[PDB]
Amino acid sequence: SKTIVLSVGEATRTLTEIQSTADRQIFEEKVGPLVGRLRLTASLRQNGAKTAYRVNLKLDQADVVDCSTSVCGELPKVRYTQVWSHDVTIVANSTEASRKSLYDLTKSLVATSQVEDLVVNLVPLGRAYGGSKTIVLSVGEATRTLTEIQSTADRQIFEEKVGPLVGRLRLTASLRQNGAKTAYRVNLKLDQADVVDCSTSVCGELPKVRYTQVWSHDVTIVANSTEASRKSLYDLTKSLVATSQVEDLVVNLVPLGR
Amino acid sequence: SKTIVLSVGEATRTLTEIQSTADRQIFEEKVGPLVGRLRLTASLRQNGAKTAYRVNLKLDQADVVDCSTSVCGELPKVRYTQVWSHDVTIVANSTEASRKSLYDLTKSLVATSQVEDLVVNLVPLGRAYGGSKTIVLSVGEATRTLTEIQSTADRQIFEEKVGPLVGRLRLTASLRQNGAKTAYRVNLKLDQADVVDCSTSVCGELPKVRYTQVWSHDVTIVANSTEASRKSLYDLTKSLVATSQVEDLVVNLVPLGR
Amino acid sequence: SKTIVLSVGEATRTLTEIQSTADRQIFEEKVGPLVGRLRLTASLRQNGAKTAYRVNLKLDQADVVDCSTSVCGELPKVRYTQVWSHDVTIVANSTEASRKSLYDLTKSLVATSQVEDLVVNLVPLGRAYGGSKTIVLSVGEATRTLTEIQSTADRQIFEEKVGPLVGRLRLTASLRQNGAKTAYRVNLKLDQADVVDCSTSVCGELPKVRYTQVWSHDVTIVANSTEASRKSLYDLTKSLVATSQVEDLVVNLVPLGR
Known part of the structure; x- marks a missing residue:
C-alpha cells in the first residue's frame, strides 16, 4: 500500500498503512509478531476560523517479549510502550520560508547530542562551553545558539539573543514523573515568531x-526500560523527521504515505 | 553654565545645567530638537538623624523621530524613554578608602562585558570559565572574582569567597517585565560591608x-527598542560613572557641574 | 586505654576513650587545657525489626581562648563549637561489596576539592569543566561522575547517569542558616541503591x-569563625573517614578504638 521508510543506518524499517480516515492515518510495521509492532498515528486538522492547521504525529513503540522456550505454555506479550508525539501548529497565511525554517530547526534539534542524552540517559539540556549553557542548532553553515534564560524546578527555558527583543527563538524543556515513579515525561517545545519591520517604508514603526x-514534543519513557529500547525510539524519531514526507507534511500540508 | 562632559569615544556630549534647587540639579544637552534631549537629575540628601547620605542620579534618554518628509505636516515626537537610575548610600563616618573602593567597583562593574550584554542583548549574568559562574571586577591589577551562590527565578545573587564569612561583596541582579510585556527592568545592586577585627588589640573578639x-541601579528598557538605542544608553552611563565629577560626588560629596 | 589516631599530615592527634556504654562510645583528646578538647561520640544501633543498623559519629571541636596575660584574672574559655556528624544506614542482609563501595565513595567525597571549599569558603558544589556541573568521585582508577539534575534555592541534587534509570547514585547537598545569622548548616547525603537484573534467569524481568x-553529613559552622578553625575541622574529618577503624565500623560493624 502506502509506505514510509525510516532508515536507521543501513537497516530500513518500512511501515505500511492500515487506516485512512478523513484526518487520521495509521501506519504499522508488518515484520515480526502480531501483538507488538510500531505505530504512527498521523493527523491533520484546521481548528477555529480556518486560519491555523495542526499536524499531530505519534510514534508508539512496544517492547514485546516471548519466552515460551523458558516457561512452557505462554505466548508473546507486551511489557511497556514508549511514545514520541509531535504537535505542530501552522498558521495558514504563513511564508514558505518560515514553514521551512521551523522544520529545519526541529530536524536539527532532534539530531543533536543534547536531546539524545535527554531521552536516553535523562541528562538535562545545556552544556556550558566557555560561557552560558548553550544549545547549537546548525541549519547547515548557519548556527543559531540559544542561551539559557531560566531554569526552575520544572521548566528550562532557552532563547536566542541576537536580533530584536520582541521576537526570538524559544526552547521550553521540562521533565516530570507522574504516578508511582514508573514513567517519565520529556516535553520539548520550540516557538518561532516571525518579526517584521518597515521603518524604511512607514516612519516610527x-x-x-x-x-x-510551534513544534512541541511529548516523550514517554518508563523507568525500568532497556537502554537500547530508548536508543531505538530516539533513532526512529530522528529518522522520521529527516524523511522527505514529514518535510512536505509541514511545508506543503501533504499527508503521509507514498 | 555648569557642564558635564560625557565622552563616548572622541564624540563628547556636553550637558548644561537647567535647574539648581537645594537638592535637585537637572542637566540637559542642547544639541538637536527641543522636545527630546538627554537628562540628568542629580540629587543629594541626608535622611534620618544625619548619619547617612543618599546620592540619586537618573540618566534619561528619549528617542525622538521626525518624519515631516514622509507624511506632510507632522512635528518631531518621542517614541519611548529609557532611563538608568542610580541609588548610592554613603554613611557619614566612613573611611575615605571605603568610599573610593565602592566607586572603583561600580566603575568596573559597568565597564565589563557581562553588564553590557545584560542591557543590550538581555543576556543574564555570569559566565562559567572552568568552574562556577563568576564575574571578575578588576580595579587595576587586583581582580575580585564573585562566584554565584543562588539563581532563583527572580534574583541572581553573586558573592566573593575570599576572607571572613561575616562581610563579603554582594551582587543581586534581577530582571522583570511589568505590564503588557512592553518594558523590561534590570536591577543591579552591589553591597560592600566594612569588616574589622580587633583580635590583635582585644582578645576573644x-x-x-x-x-x-550600597550602589544600586535601575535600568528601564522598552521591549521594541533599537539596538543602538540600548547601546548608547549603556555607553553614556559607562562614560558618566568614569568621570571625575561623579567620583567626587561619591567620595567628597561635591555636587555635579563645573 | 583505647585510642584513635587521626593523622592531619605529619602531626598525629590521638584521642583516648572516656566512656563505653552499650551503644555510646565517647573519645577525647588529652593534651591542652581541660575546658575545650576534641570529642568523638560514636554510636551503633539496630532500630525496628532488627533489619538495619545505624552508625552515628559526631566530631565536635571547640575553639578555646585564654588571655589571662591580656586581662588580669580570667580563665580559659570556649568561644564557639563546630561539629561534623555522620548518619550511616546499613541494612543487615547486605553484600560486603555494597558496604565497601559506600565507604569508598564517602571517603572520596570528603577528600575532593569541592567539599573542602563547601565547608571552608562556603562555595557551592559543582564545577562545569566542558559540559554540565559535575562532581568526580574517583575510587582509584574508576571515576564515577555525578551530573547536576536540580538546583533549587535550598537543595542541590546530583546524580550519576550511566546504567539503568531505576537505581542511581545521589548527592543532595544543602546549606542553611538558622537563627540570627550566626551559624550555617551544610548537609550532604549520598544514597546508594543496589540494583539487580534477573533477565538471564527469569524472562521478562x-x-x-x-x-x-545512605551516608548523611551535618556540618555546623558559625559565621564568625577563623579560617584555620574551619580548615582543621575538615582536615580531621577527612582524616577520620580515612582510618582503618571507621572502615571496619561500616563494613564489619566493629566499634571504634583499639
Missing part, C-alpha cells in the same frame, strides 16, 4: 510579531 | 561589620 | 532495587 509557529 | 554602602 | 544505604 518598531518591529512586531505577526504570527507564531 | 571575632570579626564584625561596621556599616554597609 | 526488568531491573529493580533491593535496598538503599
Whole structure:
C-alpha cells in the first residue's frame, strides 16, 4: 500500500498503512509478531476560523517479549510502550520560508547530542562551553545558539539573543514523573515568531510579531526500560523527521504515505 | 553654565545645567530638537538623624523621530524613554578608602562585558570559565572574582569567597517585565560591608561589620527598542560613572557641574 | 586505654576513650587545657525489626581562648563549637561489596576539592569543566561522575547517569542558616541503591532495587569563625573517614578504638 521508510543506518524499517480516515492515518510495521509492532498515528486538522492547521504525529513503540522456550505454555506479550508525539501548529497565511525554517530547526534539534542524552540517559539540556549553557542548532553553515534564560524546578527555558527583543527563538524543556515513579515525561517545545519591520517604508514603526509557529514534543519513557529500547525510539524519531514526507507534511500540508 | 562632559569615544556630549534647587540639579544637552534631549537629575540628601547620605542620579534618554518628509505636516515626537537610575548610600563616618573602593567597583562593574550584554542583548549574568559562574571586577591589577551562590527565578545573587564569612561583596541582579510585556527592568545592586577585627588589640573578639554602602541601579528598557538605542544608553552611563565629577560626588560629596 | 589516631599530615592527634556504654562510645583528646578538647561520640544501633543498623559519629571541636596575660584574672574559655556528624544506614542482609563501595565513595567525597571549599569558603558544589556541573568521585582508577539534575534555592541534587534509570547514585547537598545569622548548616547525603537484573534467569524481568544505604553529613559552622578553625575541622574529618577503624565500623560493624 502506502509506505514510509525510516532508515536507521543501513537497516530500513518500512511501515505500511492500515487506516485512512478523513484526518487520521495509521501506519504499522508488518515484520515480526502480531501483538507488538510500531505505530504512527498521523493527523491533520484546521481548528477555529480556518486560519491555523495542526499536524499531530505519534510514534508508539512496544517492547514485546516471548519466552515460551523458558516457561512452557505462554505466548508473546507486551511489557511497556514508549511514545514520541509531535504537535505542530501552522498558521495558514504563513511564508514558505518560515514553514521551512521551523522544520529545519526541529530536524536539527532532534539530531543533536543534547536531546539524545535527554531521552536516553535523562541528562538535562545545556552544556556550558566557555560561557552560558548553550544549545547549537546548525541549519547547515548557519548556527543559531540559544542561551539559557531560566531554569526552575520544572521548566528550562532557552532563547536566542541576537536580533530584536520582541521576537526570538524559544526552547521550553521540562521533565516530570507522574504516578508511582514508573514513567517519565520529556516535553520539548520550540516557538518561532516571525518579526517584521518597515521603518524604511512607514516612519516610527518598531518591529512586531505577526504570527507564531510551534513544534512541541511529548516523550514517554518508563523507568525500568532497556537502554537500547530508548536508543531505538530516539533513532526512529530522528529518522522520521529527516524523511522527505514529514518535510512536505509541514511545508506543503501533504499527508503521509507514498 | 555648569557642564558635564560625557565622552563616548572622541564624540563628547556636553550637558548644561537647567535647574539648581537645594537638592535637585537637572542637566540637559542642547544639541538637536527641543522636545527630546538627554537628562540628568542629580540629587543629594541626608535622611534620618544625619548619619547617612543618599546620592540619586537618573540618566534619561528619549528617542525622538521626525518624519515631516514622509507624511506632510507632522512635528518631531518621542517614541519611548529609557532611563538608568542610580541609588548610592554613603554613611557619614566612613573611611575615605571605603568610599573610593565602592566607586572603583561600580566603575568596573559597568565597564565589563557581562553588564553590557545584560542591557543590550538581555543576556543574564555570569559566565562559567572552568568552574562556577563568576564575574571578575578588576580595579587595576587586583581582580575580585564573585562566584554565584543562588539563581532563583527572580534574583541572581553573586558573592566573593575570599576572607571572613561575616562581610563579603554582594551582587543581586534581577530582571522583570511589568505590564503588557512592553518594558523590561534590570536591577543591579552591589553591597560592600566594612569588616574589622580587633583580635590583635582585644582578645576573644571575632570579626564584625561596621556599616554597609550600597550602589544600586535601575535600568528601564522598552521591549521594541533599537539596538543602538540600548547601546548608547549603556555607553553614556559607562562614560558618566568614569568621570571625575561623579567620583567626587561619591567620595567628597561635591555636587555635579563645573 | 583505647585510642584513635587521626593523622592531619605529619602531626598525629590521638584521642583516648572516656566512656563505653552499650551503644555510646565517647573519645577525647588529652593534651591542652581541660575546658575545650576534641570529642568523638560514636554510636551503633539496630532500630525496628532488627533489619538495619545505624552508625552515628559526631566530631565536635571547640575553639578555646585564654588571655589571662591580656586581662588580669580570667580563665580559659570556649568561644564557639563546630561539629561534623555522620548518619550511616546499613541494612543487615547486605553484600560486603555494597558496604565497601559506600565507604569508598564517602571517603572520596570528603577528600575532593569541592567539599573542602563547601565547608571552608562556603562555595557551592559543582564545577562545569566542558559540559554540565559535575562532581568526580574517583575510587582509584574508576571515576564515577555525578551530573547536576536540580538546583533549587535550598537543595542541590546530583546524580550519576550511566546504567539503568531505576537505581542511581545521589548527592543532595544543602546549606542553611538558622537563627540570627550566626551559624550555617551544610548537609550532604549520598544514597546508594543496589540494583539487580534477573533477565538471564527469569524472562521478562526488568531491573529493580533491593535496598538503599545512605551516608548523611551535618556540618555546623558559625559565621564568625577563623579560617584555620574551619580548615582543621575538615582536615580531621577527612582524616577520620580515612582510618582503618571507621572502615571496619561500616563494613564489619566493629566499634571504634583499639
